Symmetry: C2
Subunit: 300 residues, 2 copies
């Protein structure tokens, strides 16, 4: 009967509950069923919950949604939209305002002496996007820093603010939620690198939900936001009304995942040729498929 | 080594070869391999050839492409484009110019006394599209005519012209190729019903072709038409340069196939309720999936 709604650990539950509870209470009123929040210590807990039918619908990032579609019987059906009109969000590297580091060059030059707060291994902005553009494209490794730990966006931002880690990954959403959870902390941060645009986060359901359940859920998302009270709830989440979506929104993250695999395989001093060819062509086939799909979407 | 290119039986081979041979000769010159035409007596022969790896690439209609994707390891990668700027093509019912039948009402009123040339069971414009809008939506059957045979578009158009069958399915492309194959025959035809727009026909390859083969084929299609001689070959096929495409172009035909299944199941005097519900909801789940996908494409 009750629905379980998975919420990724971008922030503490303490900070998430006040944004999410009124939304899930509105969902309950409209679906006529109980809706329970499902949290986990990392993104993998939501994906695994969905794989085992313990999570029915979830808010994911694009990378964790990709893994849920591939591994957890997931399907995207809606996309979040920034309340401020931004067309997606961006990944960043942050250091403290008192750091003499001002750009990626200065960072990489001193990496052996600096501690690094990397993201959740399933985070688009926390892990994959800096993982390709900062590390892979520079032929370096998070292991090349003095010390590295993985943590969620809120933990990383506060550790940099609090001078507990020298640099960390983060994102522009999470930085804006600092204006709420922790404002004098935002003033202690300085962005030294910003990614290309990342698409807005998907909402995903498990494909084995009934037809009538999906229709009710989809109607709820597509129509949410039409009243004053729903507008106020979206505003607190940092969102405008949702957009219809599909697994096609994941293409640029699939591409980025294969690009990282490619830049890795090609920077790999430890394969021969019969075998750097075989692996290169297998990743290339997949990239070609996504390029052709993109060409098709463009020409529609 | 050699590629087999499947060509659906919209016309006789006698009429197809002069349009197709120069195109396939240009393909050979560019791919540096032999390209052989693969014909069959009906569309099913091309789909089955692809299923058994005897056909590598094919020009299909949307319905036969749907069946090849579902059954024959096919994938759409390009779409044909009308040389005259039309945005797709249309299905028709034709009678002879000397018939007193002028519209679908007159036709259906006298159907018990008329012979009917239906299309190839795998033809979009010959079978499925009139099958839903003419027959299913009118709660009637091709069995309700005096006699019915299935035949390809050219055979049907000539039989109506030649006063050998009273009415037949056809399409606006095939009628325009009559201006070429058989002009005084076109003057003997009268269109009494026209469908909504059908998307342009896809070109499809089998998914197990190598990465380098697909890249060469795709490059050939995307770039064809840039020279005088290639323009002349496309013009003879009735085409402009190709458009990048994907399996997403098949959505409206998938929908139409499910609509026909639905109108059938709901006009079915011979199921109970526990069972008109179970089948109705299964077809509805699929239609809902395609509606959601359409909503997503629209909102991109």
């Amino acid at each position: 009967k009750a629905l379980n709604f998975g919420i990724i650990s971008t922030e503490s539950q303490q900070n998430l509950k006040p944004q999410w509870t009124p939304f899930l209470q509105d969902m309950e009123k409209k679906l006529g069923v109980k809706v329970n929040a499902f949290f986990a210590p990392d993104y993998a807990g939501i994906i695994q919950g969905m794989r085992f039918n313990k999570v029915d619908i979830a808010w994911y990032g694009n990378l964790s949604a990709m893994e849920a579609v591939d591994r957890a019987n997931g399907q995207v059906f809606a996309q979040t939209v920034a309340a401020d009109g931004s067309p997606g969000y961006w990944s960043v590297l942050i250091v403290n305002k008192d750091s003499p580091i001002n750009n990626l060059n200065d960072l990489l030059a001193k990496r052996k002496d600096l501690t690094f707060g990397n993201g959740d291994p399933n985070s688009t902005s926390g892990f994959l996007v800096p993982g390709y553009y900062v590390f892979a494209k520079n032929n370096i490794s998070a292991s090349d820093f003095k010390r590295t730990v993985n943590a969620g966006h809120e933990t990383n931002a506060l550790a940099v603010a609090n001078k507990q880690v020298d640099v960390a990954t983060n994102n522009t959403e999470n930085l804006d939620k600092l204006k709420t959870s922790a404002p004098e902390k935002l003033k202690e941060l300085k962005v030294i690198w910003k990614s290309p645009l990342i698409p807005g986060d998907p909402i995903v359901w498990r494909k084995n939900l009934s037809e009538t359940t999906k229709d009710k859920i989809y109607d709820f998302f597509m129509n949410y936001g039409k009243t004053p009270e729903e507008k106020a709830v979206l505003e607190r989440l940092g969102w405008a009304p949702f957009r219809a979506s599909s697994d096609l929104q994941l293409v640029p993250i699939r591409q980025l995942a294969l690009f990282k695999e490619m830049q890795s395989v090609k920077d790999n001093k430890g394969l021969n040729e019969q075998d750097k060819l075989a692996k290169t062509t297998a990743i290339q086939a997949q990239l070609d498929d996504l390029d052709r799909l993109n060409n098709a979407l463009s020409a529609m």
